[model samples]
Target: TGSFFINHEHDWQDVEPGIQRKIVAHTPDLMAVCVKFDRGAVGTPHQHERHDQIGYVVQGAFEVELEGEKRRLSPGDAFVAPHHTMHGAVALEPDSLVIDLFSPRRDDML
Candidate 1:
């Protein structure tokens, strides 16, 4: 059975040298993840061929690059990246957090 509530007590898994992620919840078609980054950390540019993603800045600030445009985002800011579009971010402060939602859920995350 899928639980209706998710507590923020999950462990953070290190995704790279300065990045970590915690899977918040998920269904077959949707998923939420919390990604944290240290100051000056880069989220290497990449494109998803099958998934669309939206992300909200939960804390701190980031220099985000989407497609060919780059912008700085702070807390309460959000962005979206459609399928096959290149996007990435770099943390501007310590302990930056981004809450990301994905459509058609990322099977690779499982």
Candidate 2:
């Protein structure tokens, strides 16, 4: 069986300057990941051509851009990006934490 339980002690994969992520758990059709960012870090705008995404702010805040609309989101706030929708974010506070869920899993990220 694939990993069913995860611990934060797992190593984080650095995605870009000031940004890192850990794959929390996944199966063939779903995935959960945790991402952390330092203040001022940018999650560049991009689109998932055939996947749906859900992002929840776990701590701190971020300025999010979703489908050309931008807004400030804080802890407990969540957003969704359906297939082919553009989305991104900029961390507004240090050590910002976010949980990202994907449908049909981000196999490319594995």
TM-scores of the models, in the order given: 0.93, 0.93
| Model 1: residues with Cα > 4 Å off, grouped in runs | 1-7
lDDT of 2 by residue, 17-38 (tens): 8999999989989999999999
Per-residue CA lDDT of model 1 for 17-104, tens digit only, reads: 9999998889988999999999999998999999999989999999999997999999999999999989999999999999999998
lDDT of 1: 0.92
Which pairs clash in the backbone of model 1?
none
Best by TM-score: 1
Model 1, clash count?
0
